Structures are given as C-alpha cells and as structure tokens.
Amino acid sequence: AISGSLIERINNKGTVTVGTEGTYAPFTYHDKDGKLTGYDVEVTRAVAEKLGVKVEFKETQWDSMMAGLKAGRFDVVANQVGLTSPERQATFDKSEPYSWSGAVLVAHNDSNIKSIADIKGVKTAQSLTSNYGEKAKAAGAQLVPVDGLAQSLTLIEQKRADATLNDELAVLDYLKKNPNAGVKIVWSAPADEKVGSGLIVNKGNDEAVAKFSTAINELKADGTLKKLGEQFFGKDISVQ
DSSP: OTTOOHHHHHHHTOEEEEEEOSEETTTEEEOTTSOEESHHHHHHHHHHHHHTOEEEEEEOOHHHHHHHHHTTSOSEEOSSOOOOSHHHHHHEEEOSOSEEEOEEEEEETTOSOOSGGGOTTSEEEEOTTSHHHHHHHHTTOEEEEOSSHHHHHHHHHTTSOOEEEEEHHHHHHHHHHSTTSSEEEEEEOOGGGOEEEOOEEESSOHHHHHHHHHHHHHHHHTTHHHHHHHHHHSSOOOOO
16 A cells, blocks of 8 residues: 555554544543543554554544444554454454453333343344444344444433443443433443453554554553553453
C-alpha cells in the first residue's frame, strides 16, 4: 500500500490509524469538552507513545468496524474486541489483552426475563455484528438493530424492546449515570470466562502485533493500566 506496512511505520516512526466508536462510555467516548477519551482510547494513546508513532482515531459505527479493518479503513481496532467468533479467529490477530470483562443481560424492572435462555423470540436490541448481537441471534432472539448500548437501553426503557446483552462495566457505568432508568442486570456470564480485549489487526502483521504486545506489557508492569482502569472503572481489569 501507499502507506507502507504497519511494521514499517512502527519501526520507522510514522502514523498508525485506529478504529474506535467514540460513542461507548467508559471505553471510547467524548467527554463534556468534546475530547475523545475512554479506557481503550487512552490505552491506545499510551501504546502509541511507547512505540513512538503518531496515532489517528477514525470514529466508526460498530457495524462497520470489523469490515473496516478488513477493508483498510484503519490499521487496528481498539474497541473492547476479542476474537469471539471462529471468523474473527480466522481473520485477525489480537495483541496481549489490555482488559478483561464479560457480558450481562439487561431487562426492564419487573420483567420475567431471568436468563440468556429466556430471550428466544424476544425483542433484543443490539448492534447486529457485535459479539452481543451474534449471541442474541444464536439465542433465538428477535433482534432490533441499533447503534450500541445507550440506544438499546432507550428502547428497553421505552418498552420498545425487552432485553439486551452488553458489557458488565459499560452497563454499570450507564446505571451510575442513570440511576432510576427502569432497567436492571438480570443475568451474568460466568466470571471465570471473561474475554480479553486487545488491539486487533489483520493477519499478516505478526511483527507489529509483537510491538503492540510489548508496549501493553510494559504499561501493565509500570502501573499505567492499573491507573487507567481506576480512572474509568474504579478497578484494574488488566490482569487475568
């Protein structure tokens, strides 16, 4: 490509592009002054400094994200992604994880929905191509497409959908901000089966992955991930 390979740009101190939503607190969002921040964004900035590269974030709709990575929209995705499908496993590589977390199911207060087993045939608001959307599909839910978590919760609040799967920490963050929303966590995925999210690249970039993982390991060792997890979640979620 016109850009040179990713490892060339890492080793030669060029520019790396990163896909992220910018609409998913506390991972990747804009603060009250319009600054792009969130755990994944700040981790990525710290990685870029360790590698001596310029970083540019390409804000992207979730349902365009992994397609975008595959089509060259950006070099890397930083957006709470693990290789959670056989397809992702066949197509992409993931750095050392920077965080571990897992899913929960949200329903309206006073719902009869108690489990991922209870969503067959139920209106379940999701981004279609997320791990959550694909799992809702596998569970036999009737999916209602949306642009992510905040809109899915709007639908449940308004009784326009009945459930959603999403990340525990994103849901808890939302409930801190919206403490009488009318929704609740009704089910949790197993705490010992968390997903490790890392920087995602196309296969064929092994050396670049090693550089990302080395940086992430140093940010763990020097306490940066602990600090950033404190800031965004109130706990360090980088170890497992």
